[PDB]
Design a protein around this nucleic acid. Structure first.
Length: 76
RNA sequence: UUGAUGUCACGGAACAGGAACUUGAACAACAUCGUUAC
């Protein structure tokens, strides 16, 4: 039994340079959701081994958003 | 609220002394954000 430490989705990297993990995609990446408790994961950084998931994104401009951190913490 | 036979109060400048002063280039490069894996 214990408390849940939930801080939200962070560890985000945003740019316009079209980095390596935003390019290796399956096309038509979605736009930015308006609230949390809704942002789910989209792709994997490693594809042969099911390692760390990511979330590639976009907006009305050419800003590319990638995000790690698929977990929260819990102290008991 | 006066008292008578005697009021120059128009008989008297609120006047005389004290620096809103001292100190200050409209200028500029290194990051921000947190977790993943056994």
């Amino acid at each position: 039994e214990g408390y849940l430490h939930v801080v939200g989705p962070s560890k985000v990297e945003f740019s316009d340079k079209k980095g390596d993990v935003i390019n290796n995609f399956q096309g038509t990446l979605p736009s930015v959701p308006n609230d949390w408790k809704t942002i789910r994961t989209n792709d994997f950084k490693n594809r042969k081994r099911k390692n760390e998931p990511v979330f590639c994104c976009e907006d009305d401009k050419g800003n590319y958003y990638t995000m790690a951190k698929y977990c929260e913490t819990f102290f008991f």
